[PDB]
Write an enzyme that holds these catalytic residues in place. Structure first.
Site, PDB file in Angstrom:
ATOM      1  N   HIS A  16       0.578  -1.230  -0.053  1.00 57.99           N
ATOM      2  CA  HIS A  16      -0.022  -0.266  -0.037  1.00 57.99           C
ATOM      3  C   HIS A  16       0.969   1.309   0.082  1.00 57.99           C
ATOM      4  CE1 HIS A  16       0.291   0.375   4.536  1.00 57.99           C
ATOM      5  NE2 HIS A  16       0.755  -0.779   4.334  1.00 57.99           N
ATOM      6  N   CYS A  45       5.240  -3.304   7.448  1.00 55.94           N
ATOM      7  CA  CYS A  45       4.275  -2.469   6.562  1.00 55.94           C
ATOM      8  C   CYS A  45       4.763  -2.339   5.291  1.00 55.94           C
ATOM      9  CB  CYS A  45       3.974  -1.171   7.253  1.00 55.94           C
ATOM     10  SG  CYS A  45       2.997  -1.401   8.753  1.00 55.94           S
TER      11      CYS A  45
HETATM   12  C1  LIG Z   1       2.519   0.443   8.806  1.00 55.85           C
HETATM   13  O1  LIG Z   1       2.832   1.196   7.891  1.00 55.85           O
HETATM   14  C2  LIG Z   1       1.534   0.708   9.753  1.00 55.85           C
HETATM   15  C3  LIG Z   1       0.625  -0.399  10.303  1.00 55.85           C
HETATM   16  C4  LIG Z   1      -0.360  -0.776   9.101  1.00 55.85           C
HETATM   17  C5  LIG Z   1      -1.304  -1.327  10.138  1.00 55.85           C
HETATM   18  S1  LIG Z   1      -2.505  -2.616   9.420  1.00 55.85           S
HETATM   19  C6  LIG Z   1      -3.399  -1.532   8.511  1.00 55.85           C
HETATM   20  C7  LIG Z   1      -4.344  -2.337   7.628  1.00 55.85           C
HETATM   21  N1  LIG Z   1      -3.970  -3.290   6.563  1.00 55.85           N
HETATM   22  C8  LIG Z   1      -5.038  -3.636   6.116  1.00 55.85           C
HETATM   23  N2  LIG Z   1      -6.219  -4.519   6.664  1.00 55.85           N
HETATM   24  C9  LIG Z   1      -1.073  -1.179  11.481  1.00 55.85           C
HETATM   25  C10 LIG Z   1      -1.759  -1.773  12.420  1.00 55.85           C
HETATM   26  O2  LIG Z   1      -1.309  -1.774  13.581  1.00 55.85           O
HETATM   27  O3  LIG Z   1      -2.803  -2.459  12.166  1.00 55.85           O
HETATM   28  N3  LIG Z   1      -0.033  -0.313  11.539  1.00 55.85           N
HETATM   29  C11 LIG Z   1       2.703   1.095  10.940  1.00 55.85           C
HETATM   30  C12 LIG Z   1       3.239   2.385  10.770  1.00 55.85           C
HETATM   31  O4  LIG Z   1       1.866   1.426  12.303  1.00 55.85           O
END
Ligand SMILES: *C(=O)[C@@H]([C@@H]1CC(SCCNC=N)=C(C(=O)O)N1)[C@@H](C)O
Length: 169
Positions: A126, A142
């Site tokens: 993403h 991520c």
């Molecule tokens: C990463 O960049 C973030 C991380 C992303 C997510 S999950 C988001 C949704 N994904 C799809 N369903 C985080 C989380 O804890 O859910 N955080 C990081 C910088 O915090």
């Protein structure tokens, strides 16, 4: 014509989890794979109806946690390499493959221009509003990059792009 997708499940996977892991209905993944009415099996292989085959597709995403960079590849050669979140001390080689299964329309918010999905639960490709943690911080694994970067990849990598995440050595 172009073939539909294949998947090979990993020990512990379950029907529902895998279906909407593939953004689908269990019944549809059942339709194509009556083995799964009952369940899934480690190393078992399943078809993802309505989704094309990653072998008809030439695109190869090599993102090694060790490499800390996600490499795009077409026809056995890289297209370009994008930085992702690996961490500073995160081992355990995930010996499995995922596929670029989806891309989402311009959300409109800090979701990062595009939402592209991987094929195993809590993994996705993403975009962001903060790229400074990308490749250079412990952003809890991520796989996100710059808006236009994730749309570059996005439009090139089809609904069945092969992507592996491995620490290597
Ligand atoms: C990463 O960049 C973030 C991380 C992303 C997510 S999950 C988001 C949704 N994904 C799809 N369903 C985080 C989380 O804890 O859910 N955080 C990081 C910088 O915090």
């Amino acid at each position: 014509g172009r073939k539909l997708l294949t998947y090979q499940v990993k020990q512990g996977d379950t029907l529902n989890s895998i279906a909407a892991d593939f953004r689908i209905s269990t019944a549809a993944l059942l339709q194509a794979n009556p083995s799964l009415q009952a369940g899934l099996t480690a190393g078992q292989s399943i078809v993802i109806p309505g989704l094309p085959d990653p072998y008809t597709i030439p695109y190869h995403i090599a993102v090694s946690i060790g490499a800390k960079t996600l490499t795009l590849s077409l026809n056995n050669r890289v297209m370009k390499t994008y930085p992702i979140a690996v961490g500073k001390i995160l081992t355990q080689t995930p010996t499995g493959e995922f596929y670029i299964i989806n891309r989402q329309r311009n959300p409109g918010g800090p979701f990062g221009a595009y939402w592209l999905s991987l094929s195993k639960q809590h993994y996705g490709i993403h975009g962001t509003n903060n790229p400074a943690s990308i490749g250079k911080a412990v952003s809890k694994g991520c796989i996100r990059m710059h808006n236009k970067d994730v749309i570059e990849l996005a439009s090139i990598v089809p609904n069945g792009t092969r992507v592996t995440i491995n620490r290597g050595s």
